[PDB]
């Protein structure tokens, strides 16, 4: 995985690649690593895939109940606090490495959380196996007072660095833009720079190629 | 980490580098290791980032609840709450914490809490991996009842050397000044402190 988060003028943007691996093999060439905790709080997850999804959903569920209970829009620091205390309790055994970002009545926020439960604050962050490739780009091109379109460009460039240079990362770039006063816009497959070329041959078999021993109609009705 | 806290005439100053480490990779070069557990009781964190954050959060909660019932807690009391957590959970924690606060009766006070969870009240304290390299320097240069400017220079020069020799320390030098006047945050960048 390569994931990044970048703050700008009036909000925050996060991005991620779309490769999931099992050892050296690519299982999904287009998985979604960008998760919705609340409408305007999103999170990018690296590490153990089931852990990032499950921890994201649990805190997202509790955040919704909390929002309904308090009659208030949820805050990023609440998601941050709930995630870190959950992860700390499990002493790193829940392998979720997250970049949490969003907007709320307090403003725009960008955090990262490690599996053992430590949190960081920053204007630009990167996690995952391609974080070094991404951080190299972020450290080279980041500046104070970025515009929306500049931050998206920087974020996706940082993800591309991971896609091309990290074997753990690949395929596409997903983006989510969270701007203050506006709806969060999730940009699924914002870039698709790894389209499979036309195959040289069709491997459609002549009908009857496969030897068959038995046929039978399966009853799915009651 | 390289951290320290130093008492002086008007109160106490806390100091720290800004490096977080994940092997030889710098996971965060602008970390804030100086942390508020009460208005004028702060702590320097060293060891595990997760452990020290979890401890500091629990202490802040305890002192907030203390304040609601009994008013402002003493610096000694804050150190006792840190100790209780560090001592009783010594098997599962990697946390070297320096507690520093300002009373009006007691003025500036510094308590250091090493790995085992023992408490040691001192005029000044140094801790973290980078502290090893400045024991000689700090012992030779520390004086009691220094001024604010002298104490800032003492911490700046000390952490500068700790940062210079310790690979696990670096970035900016953060400082927090605790006096009757209030709470002041100071920052010092590489271009200044490296050429000291």
């Amino acid at each position: 995985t390569t994931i990044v988060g970048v703050k700008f003028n009036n909000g925050v943007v996060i991005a991620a690649d779309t490769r999931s691996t099992q050892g050296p093999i690519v299982a999904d060439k287009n998985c979604a690593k960008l998760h919705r905790i609340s409408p305007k709080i999103w999170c990018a997850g690296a590490g153990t895939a089931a852990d990032t999804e499950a921890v994201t959903q649990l805190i997202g569920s509790n955040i919704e109940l909390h929002s309904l209970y308090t009659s208030r829009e949820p805050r990023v620091v609440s998601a941050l606090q709930m995630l870190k205390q959950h992860l700390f309790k499990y002493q790193g055994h829940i392998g979720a490495y997250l970049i949490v970002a969003g907007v709320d009545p307090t403003g725009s926020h960008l955090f990262s959380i490690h599996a053992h439960g430590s949190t960081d604050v920053g204007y630009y962050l990167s996690l995952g196996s391609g974080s070094l490739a991404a951080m190299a780009v972020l450290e080279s091109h980041w500046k104070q007072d970025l515009t929306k379109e500049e931050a998206i460009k920087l974020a996706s460039d940082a993800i591309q660095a991971g896609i091309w240079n990290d074997l753990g990362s690949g395929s596409n770039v997903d983006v989510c833009v969270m701007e203050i006063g506006k709806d969060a816009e999730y940009l699924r497959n914002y870039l698709t720079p790894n389209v499979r070329e036309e195959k040289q041959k069709s491997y459609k078999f002549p009908r009857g190629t496969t030897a068959v021993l038995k046929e039978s109609i399966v009853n799915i009705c009651d | 980490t390289s951290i320290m806290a130093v008492t002086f005439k008007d109160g106490v100053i806390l100091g720290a580098d800004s490096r977080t480490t994940t092997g030889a990779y710098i996971a965060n070069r602008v970390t804030d290791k100086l942390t508020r557990v009460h208005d004028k009781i702060w702590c320097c964190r060293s060891g595990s980032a997760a452990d020290t954050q979890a401890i500091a959060d629990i202490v802040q909660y305890h002192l907030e609840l203390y304040t609601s019932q009994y008013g402002t807690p003493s610096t000694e009391t804050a150190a006792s709450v840190f100790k209780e957590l560090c001592y009783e959970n010594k098997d599962n924690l990697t946390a070297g914490i320096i507690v520093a606060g300002y009373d009006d009766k007691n003025k500036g006070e510094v308590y250091t809490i090493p790995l085992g969870g023992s408490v040691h009240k001192l005029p000044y304290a140094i801790a973290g991996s980078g502290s090893t390299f400045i024991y000689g320097y700090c012992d030779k240069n520390f004086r009691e009842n220094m001024s604010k400017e002298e104490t800032v220079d003492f911490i700046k020069h000390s952490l500068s050397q700790a940062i210079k020799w310790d690979g696990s320390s670096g970035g900016v030098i953060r400082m927090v000044v605790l006096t009757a006047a209030g709470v002041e945050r100071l920052i010092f960048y590489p271009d200044e402190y490296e050429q000291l």
Binding site: - | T20, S46, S48, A49, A50
Partner: peptide
Amino acid sequence: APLX
């Protein structure tokens, strides 16, 4: 894990 992150250390200080």
